[PDB]
């Protein structure tokens, strides 16, 4: 604790230290060029080495916030590039870093990163691996200034492994592109869950987050006592509360302390934490958050004894309601790791609603005597949706499943723009193929995680340009009722059909020369416009048009004159049967 930067350097190692220092500066000086950040990192790294050689060297006793802030305020172009951020450099350190944190631009006006060609990437990866990888780590950090820097380093090493493996293969793009796409989607999803959880914390209070934490931790750690789960929920709530604040050092120390406690109490938490409590301090907390569920105890009794049958239900509930409800959620969650967290919260709220009415009634024991019967329809509702949607997914393929969702959701809310209907239907289709490859024991948790990012992304684009009231209603609802609200959407019978546009249903020779993905998006776009023009069209009528369209595209591939002549016949023949 004498020299804090030296302790960081020796715990993290030189390689990880430089990467984290690059990420940290890129998240505050988002508008500075890459070569300026490399200059700061090398200067900070050479300074850290003097503290490692002599803890008593000058300025080595200063705190990390003081050293970081002081270094940040030496940037010559600070005031010219960052207007009122330079005014932070006139405040004491307790208030200076707070001032710096208030100017982290969430969505800066930076151009979209372009994925270069595969050959130019592998060539650059070979010619200068260090600057190639670090430039892109810089480009991502400056675009996600609130993304937890060690997790950004965790993905960065996955990018390095992808280039190392696939730049030596016979077909580079054969395995590099699928890995890069998988990394892109996974990174954008992780960055979405983090920002979404932080927004939910402030909008629905700390109590709603603790309930979620009790459910999740009991599924992961079913063998731990309730007191151990409740203690972890309190610490996890403090970790997520301060990590949402944005301070990197305070967030990292909280996560390190929790992982340090969990690894010292493995015998009272889980038996699955063995492999990752041996990992270095940089990776411990990250892995524990992704550890698989431990096995639940063998013969666990029914919940009716403590929560329905025996007396003192209202008495034990009235003494401390959230504790009693927390025990119910703990006992229910750890017996059902196959449930989604939100489903467990629906049952807790249902049990809560019952006690608040029953404990004030004439005969309370008679009142809640069958509270478990109310849980059956709530449990069976998502279980039937998974079976129904993936018996349909098994009848079709992924692309044909997306077309079914596309027709179904366009009918329900025709007011949503076509690009949003296309994008969400394709993503919701990816949830089908991603999760129904799993067995029944882990289908609902899979769907919950993937639906929550698609449904929030749906309203992230919808909140900016609101069109449909029924979509905003489902996203103003709590995260527990969000998915059932969207499932409860009915076909809009008050929607007048869209005016026919000839240029919309016009097709040129570009579709045959476009890529497979670009051809699908173009075909799926016209399918939305077909449903918006004729919502009352039936399944067999739409299939006839889709079959004729596929035959129209295949027959026309002369090619230019076919799309115009055969296209005029397709449009007219469809207008006679719709
Ligand atoms: O040289 C390369 C190779 C890799 C690559 C892929 C896509 C690409 O262009 C797409 C446009 C920007 C997409 N980014 C991808 C990374 N992504 C993200 C967000 C949070 C965490 C994490 Cl870990 C991540 Cl990855 C943000 C959005 C360019 C490149 N450039
Ligand atoms: C140990 C106390 C943990 C927190 C108390 C659990 C209460 C569960 C009630 C469930 C209803 C609220 C769910 C929500 O708002 O998201
Ligand atoms: C150099 C600055 C170091 C700040 C980041 C430390 C990362 C420690 C992460 C530990 C954890 O996630 O539990
Ligand atoms: C993924 C939620 C936790 C993110 C904060 C990192 C804390 C890591 C140690 C706590 C592990 C909690 C396990 C869990 O996610 O249920
Ligand atoms: C389409 C992807 C499969 C459909 C899954 C729908 C059921 C999701 C249940 C989530 C929840 O508990 O609210
Ligand atoms: C487009 C509007 C979003 C559609 C709702 C997605 C919910 C996931 C499927 C659940 C269901 O099939 O009922
Ligand atoms: C007015 C009707 C004009 C023709 C409408 C074109 C509809 C195109 C839908 C394409 C979806 C199926 C694609 C395929 O079968 O591969």
């Amino acid at each position: 604790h004498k020299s804090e930067v030296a302790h960081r350097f020796k715990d993290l190692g030189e390689e990880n230290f430089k990467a984290l220092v690059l990420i940290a500066f890129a998240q505050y000086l988002q508008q500075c060029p890459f070569e300026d950040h490399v200059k700061l990192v090398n200067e900070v790294t050479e300074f850290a080495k003097t503290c490692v050689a002599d803890e008593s060297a000058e300025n080595c006793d200063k705190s990390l916030h003081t050293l970081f802030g002081d270094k940040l305020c030496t940037v010559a172009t600070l005031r010219e590039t960052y207007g009122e951020m330079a005014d932070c450099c006139a405040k004491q350190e307790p208030e200076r870093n707070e001032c710096f944190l208030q100017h982290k631009d969430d969505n800066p006006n930076l151009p979209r990163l372009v994925r270069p060609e595969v050959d130019v990437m592998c060539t650059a990866f070979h010619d200068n691996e260090e600057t190639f990888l670090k430039k892109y780590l810089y480009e991502i950090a400056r675009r996600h200034p609130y993304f937890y820097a060690p997790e950004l380093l965790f993905f960065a090493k996955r990018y390095k492994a992808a280039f190392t493996e696939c730049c030596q293969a016979a077909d580079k793009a054969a395995c590099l592109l699928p890995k890069l796409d998988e990394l892109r989607d996974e990174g954008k999803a992780s960055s979405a869950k983090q920002r979404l959880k932080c927004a939910s914390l402030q909008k629905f209070g700390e109590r709603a987050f603790k309930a979620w934490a009790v459910a999740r931790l009991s599924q992961r750690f079913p063998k731990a006592e309730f007191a151990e789960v409740s203690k972890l929920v309190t610490d996890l709530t403090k970790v997520h509360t301060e990590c949402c604040h944005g301070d990197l050092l305070e967030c990292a120390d909280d996560r390190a302390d929790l992982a340090k406690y969990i690894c010292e109490n493995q015998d009272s938490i889980s038996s699955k934490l063995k492999e990752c409590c041996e990992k270095p301090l940089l990776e411990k907390s990250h892995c524990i958050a992704e550890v698989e569920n431990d096995e639940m105890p063998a013969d666990l009794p029914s919940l009716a004894a403590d929560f329905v049958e025996s007396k003192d239900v209202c008495k034990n509930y009235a003494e401390a309601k959230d504790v009693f409800l927390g025990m119910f959620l703990y006992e229910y969650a750890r017996r059902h790791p196959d449930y989604s967290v939100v489903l467990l919260l629906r049952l807790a709220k249902t049990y809560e609603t019952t006690l608040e009415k029953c404990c004030a009634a004439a005969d309370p024991h008679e009142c809640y005597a069958k509270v478990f019967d109310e849980f059956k329809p709530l449990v069976e509702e998502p279980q039937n949706l998974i079976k129904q949607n993936c018996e349909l997914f098994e009848q079709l393929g992924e692309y044909k499943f997306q077309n079914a969702l596309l027709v179904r959701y366009t009918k329900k809310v025709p007011q949503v723009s076509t690009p949003t209907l296309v994008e969400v239907s394709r993503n919701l289709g990816k949830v089908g193929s991603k999760c129904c490859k799993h067995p029944e024991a882990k289908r609902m948790p899979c769907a919950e995680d993937y639906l929550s990012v698609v449904l929030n992304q749906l309203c992230v684009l919808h909140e900016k340009t609101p069109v449909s009231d029924r979509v905003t209603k489902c996203c103003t609802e709590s995260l527990v009722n969000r998915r059932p609200c969207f499932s409860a959407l009915e076909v809009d019978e008050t929607y007048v059909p869209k005016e026919f546009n000839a240029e919309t249903f016009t097709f040129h020779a570009d579709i045959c020369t476009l890529s497979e993905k670009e051809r699908q998006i173009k075909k799926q776009t016209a399918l939305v416009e077909l449903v918006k023009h004729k919502p009352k069209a039936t399944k067999e009528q739409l299939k006839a048009v889709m079959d004729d369209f596929a035959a129209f595209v295949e027959k026309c591939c002369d090619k230019e004159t076919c799309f115009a002549e055969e296209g005029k016949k397709l449009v007219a023949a469809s207008q006679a049967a719709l």
Side-chain angles (χ1 to χ4, degrees), residues 3-57 59-79 81-91 93-94 96-105 107-194 196-201 204-273 276-280 282-289 291 293-298 300-310 312-314 316-356 358-369 371-375 377-379 381-386 388-390 392-393 395-399 401-436 438-441 443-459 461-462 465-468 470-478 480-498 500-502 504-510 512-516 520-521 524-529 531-533 535-538 540-554 556-558 562-564 566-567 569-577:
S3 177
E4 199 60 38
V5 69
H7 188 81
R8 293 300 183 178
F9 190 88
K10 298 160 67 178
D11 293 0
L12 292 163
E14 183 177 349
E15 284 302 320
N16 295 325
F17 182 91
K18 300 170 76 176
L20 293 173
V21 170
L22 178 63
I23 299 171
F25 279 112
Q27 291 180 322
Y28 287 86
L29 309 179
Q30 306 170 251
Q31 292 293 339
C32 283
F34 170 73
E35 289 71 35
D36 294 5
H37 281 88
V38 179
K39 181 177 176 179
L40 305 184
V41 167
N42 295 338
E43 288 169 348
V44 169
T45 293
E46 294 307 277
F47 169 76
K49 287 172 183 291
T50 72
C51 302
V52 179
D54 187 354
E55 45 177 303
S56 303
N59 307 331
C60 290
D61 51 358
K62 297 182 178 179
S63 64
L64 290 177
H65 277 138
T66 295
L67 296 170
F68 185 74
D70 285 4
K71 187 60 182 178
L72 215 53
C73 295
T74 56
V75 174
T77 56
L78 192 61
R79 182 169 192 83
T81 304
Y82 320 93
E84 71 186 283
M85 188 186 303
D87 298 336
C88 300
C89 292
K91 304 183 183 301
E93 187 44 55
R96 184 175 62 175
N97 189 77
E98 292 301 323
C99 184
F100 282 142
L101 214 54
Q102 296 162 356
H103 297 97
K104 268 192 174 178
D105 201 320
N107 47 272
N109 303 326
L110 290 175
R112 179 182 66 84
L113 212 58
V114 282
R115 178 188 297 184
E117 302 294 336
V118 176
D119 49 359
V120 325
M121 283 191 301
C122 285
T123 295
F125 168 76
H126 171 79
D127 286 358
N128 197 340
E129 181 176 339
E130 217 285 331
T131 66
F132 172 79
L133 297 172
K134 288 308 179 61
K135 173 74 120 301
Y136 281 101
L137 179 65
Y138 151 88
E139 294 289 353
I140 303 306
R142 66 200 292 251
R143 287 176 173 82
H144 304 270
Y146 292 93
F147 196 72
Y148 187 53
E151 188 176 356
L152 200 56
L153 184 53
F154 149 81
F155 284 95
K157 306 186 176 184
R158 301 176 60 180
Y159 275 103
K160 169 173 174 293
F163 285 105
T164 296
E165 174 184 342
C166 282
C167 289
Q168 294 188 0
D171 187 3
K172 321 279 187 57
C175 65
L176 180 51
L177 295 183
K179 290 182 170 62
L180 292 179
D181 294 332
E182 178 182 5
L183 284 173
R184 190 199 76 260
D185 289 349
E186 181 175 349
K188 295 201 280 78
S190 171
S191 174
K193 306 177 182 181
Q194 170 180 322
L196 172 60
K197 284 185 174 177
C198 293
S200 307
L201 184 57
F204 295 99
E206 183 170 314
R207 177 181 186 267
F209 185 88
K210 278 190 178 187
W212 172 92
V214 175
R216 188 57 242 176
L217 290 181
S218 303
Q219 291 184 313
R220 296 272 185 100
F221 310 136
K223 287 175 175 172
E225 299 186 358
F226 172 70
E228 195 64 277
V229 172
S230 186
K231 193 266 181 185
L232 297 173
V233 166
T234 298
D235 296 6
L236 185 67
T237 301
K238 176 177 180 176
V239 167
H240 271 129
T241 298
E242 312 205 86
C243 290
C244 289
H245 191 78
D247 188 11
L248 176 67
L249 294 166
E250 175 175 278
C251 173
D253 292 0
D254 288 356
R255 297 186 49 152
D257 285 332
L258 183 53
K260 176 185 169 68
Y261 171 80
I262 297 181
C263 286
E264 297 188 30
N265 300 49
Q266 299 185 46
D267 301 326
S268 300
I269 294 170
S270 177
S271 58
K272 305 304 191 66
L273 311 159
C276 275
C277 287
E278 310 166 356
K279 294 187 173 180
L282 181 61
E283 313 171 13
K284 282 210 296 182
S285 72
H286 166 83
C287 165
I288 300 179
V291 71
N293 296 337
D294 194 0
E295 279 78 45
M296 58 180 292
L300 286 178
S302 176
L303 300 200
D306 292 344
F307 299 101
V308 174
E309 294 172 349
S310 72
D312 312 338
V313 160
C314 288
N316 299 335
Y317 174 68
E319 289 186 2
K321 294 183 175 181
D322 290 354
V323 176
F324 192 78
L325 296 174
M327 295 174 59
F328 168 86
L329 183 55
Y330 154 79
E331 300 288 358
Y332 219 110
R334 67 170 183 161
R335 284 169 177 78
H336 293 86
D338 57 331
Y339 286 4
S340 59
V341 179
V342 284
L343 172 59
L344 291 161
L345 297 175
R346 295 188 195 104
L347 308 175
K349 179 61 186 298
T350 303
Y351 184 72
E352 178 188 31
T353 296
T354 290
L355 296 194
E356 286 299 330
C358 284
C359 293
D363 194 329
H365 182 264
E366 178 78 9
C367 177
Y368 55 67
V371 65
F372 284 174
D373 291 358
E374 303 198 26
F375 299 158
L378 289 173
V379 167
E381 192 263 346
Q383 285 177 338
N384 293 324
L385 273 186
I386 294 171
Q388 175 188 14
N389 278 280
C390 280
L392 175 61
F393 170 81
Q395 289 174 346
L396 317 174
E398 174 181 335
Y399 172 72
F401 185 62
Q402 293 173 341
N403 293 10
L405 307 175
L406 201 50
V407 171
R408 187 166 74 207
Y409 296 142
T410 299
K411 288 180 177 179
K412 292 179 176 297
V413 52
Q415 300 83 9
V416 165
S417 69
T418 297
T420 302
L421 277 175
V422 165
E423 182 203 12
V424 175
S425 292
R426 301 181 86 256
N427 293 335
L428 290 175
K430 295 203 295 179
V431 179
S433 63
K434 178 70 61 181
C435 290
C436 280
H438 289 111
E440 180 73 14
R443 273 185 175 183
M444 199 183 315
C446 183
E448 174 190 31
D449 291 325
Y450 287 94
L451 289 191
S452 61
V453 294
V454 177
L455 267 50
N456 180 83
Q457 167 193 2
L458 161 64
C459 273
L461 309 181
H462 189 265
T465 52
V467 183
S468 177
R470 280 141 58 250
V471 177
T472 311
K473 158 71 70 178
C474 287
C475 286
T476 54
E477 222 75 21
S478 57
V480 183
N481 300 274
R482 167 175 281 187
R483 201 278 303 152
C485 186
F486 274 109
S487 291
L489 287 179
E490 211 74 11
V491 177
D492 188 13
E493 302 289 346
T494 59
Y495 168 78
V496 288
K498 186 187 187 67
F500 175 76
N501 179 272
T504 293
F505 305 108
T506 304
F507 304 94
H508 308 146
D510 304 332
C512 288
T513 196
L514 275 168
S515 69
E516 186 44 64
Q520 288 176 344
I521 284 178
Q524 289 172 326
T525 291
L527 184 57
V528 181
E529 305 287 348
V531 180
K532 289 187 178 176
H533 173 49
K536 292 295 193 302
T538 187
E540 42 268 36
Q541 279 173 343
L542 294 170
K543 175 180 174 55
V545 178
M546 293 186 298
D547 289 340
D548 290 7
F549 176 80
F552 155 76
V553 175
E554 180 263 349
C556 285
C557 298
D558 195 6
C562 185
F563 276 90
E566 296 280 1
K569 178 181 175 185
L570 176 63
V571 173
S574 305
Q575 287 180 301

